[PDB]
Structures are given as structure tokens and as C-alpha cells.
Amino acid sequence: MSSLPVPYKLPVSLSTGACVIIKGRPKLSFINDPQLQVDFYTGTDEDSDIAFHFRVHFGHRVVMNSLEFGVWKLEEKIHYVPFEDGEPFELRIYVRHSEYEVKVNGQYIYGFAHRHPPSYVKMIQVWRDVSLTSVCVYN
Ligand SMILES: OC[C@H]1O[C@@H](O[C@H]2[C@H](O)[C@@H](O)[C@H](O)O[C@@H]2CO)[C@H](O)[C@@H](O)[C@H]1O
């Protein structure tokens, strides 16, 4: 029941081989339609673009996208992701040469083809209805 502040922001540097590990817990029950959002920004300003947007509608679906010149682009969705109601989760995002690889709770979930070079990602924001245990960037 320790937590980072939410919304949480940190500066980052991403390269091939890097891994973002996010651990926390939904802060509300699923019947309350809670959400989790992770945004990889290509700048440090409020109005910077988002190279990778990962949004969990707990109990319903996951959507992924990018924000480019202020426009949401092609939405990619996952019907089922194994987040458990009331349980802690572990989310990992690996930076590969051609895609981000998304892992949740020991399962491979998705490969998101890059739309922007990861070298341009400058900060990450993790927010909405979560308590956050830790946000680590490796390599
Ligand atoms: O694509 C990410 C983007 O989704 C918007 O919401 C979408 C919603 O996901 C979709 O089911 C519906 O058909 O259209 C909505 C508007 O495009 C969010 O508004 C936005 O914040 C992003 O999360």
C-alpha cells in the first residue's frame, strides 16, 4: 500500500533492448470501469506527440495507438488481457528493433509495430485508476 504519485512522470532514454517494467494495482473494482494508461512521449512538453499509447479499460479491452501532430492514428485493440480484478499486475514493455513487445503477468500479450523511432521517446506517463508500486527502465 506504498505508492508512487499518480499521475506518474519520468524522463527516459529508450534503445533496442530496453525494458520498461510497471507494477501496481487497479485502485477500483472492475464494475467501476477503472482504467490504466501508459504514454511514451516524444518530448517533455504537455503538447508533445505520443509514440506509444497503451490504455487498459479493465474488464473490457486494451487499446493502443499513437498521437501525431495532435491526431490519434490507427487504433489497435486487444479483446482479452489477463488483468485480474483486485490483484496486483506486472506490465513489461520491451523495445525491440521493429516493435514493442508487451508482457502482462507472465504472458506475452502483443507486438506493436513501431510508428516512430524509440530513440525519440523522452518521457513516460502512467496514470488513471491505479496505485503504482514501481516504474523502472532497464538498459
Ligand atoms: O485510440 C486511442 C484513443 O481512443 C479514444 O477513444 C476512442 C475509443 O477507443 C474507440 O472505441 C471509439 O470508437 O472512438 C474513441 C474516440 O476515438 C480516446 O478518446 C483517446 O483518449 C485514446 O485513448
Structure overview:
By secondary structure, this protein is mainly beta. The protein has strands at about 10, 20-25, 35-40, 50-55, 60-70, 70, 75-80, 90-95, 100-105, 105-115, 125-130, 130-139. Helices cover about 0% and strands about 55% of the residues. A hairpin with a 3-residue loop joins strand 8 (about 90-95) and strand 9 (about 100-105). The relative contact order is 0.36. The protein binds a molecule of 2 linked components (BGC-GAL). A molecule of 2 linked components (BGC-GAL) binds near residues 53, 65, 72 and 75. A molecule of 2 linked components (BGC-GAL) binds next to strand 4 and strand 5. One of its GO terms (biological process) is apoptotic process. Keywords: Apoptosis, Lectin.
Note the gap between the termini.
28 Å
Would you report the number of β strands?
12
What's the story with the biggest beta sheet? 7 strands, antiparallel
Present as ligands are: a molecule of 2 linked components (BGC-GAL)
Envelope shape: globular
The helical percent reads under 10%
Structural class: mainly beta
| CATH domain class | Mainly Beta
Architecture per CATH nomenclature, i.e. the level-2 architecture: Sandwich
Strand content: over 45%
Roughly how many Å is the radius of gyration? 14 Å
In DSSP terms (H or I, runs of 4 or more residues), the helix count works out at: 0
Element-by-element helix/strand order: EEEEEEEEEEEE
| CATH domain topology | Jelly Rolls
* Overall number of structural domains: 1
GO molecular function: carbohydrate binding
Protein name: Galectin
Keywords: Apoptosis, Lectin
Domain Galectin: 6-138
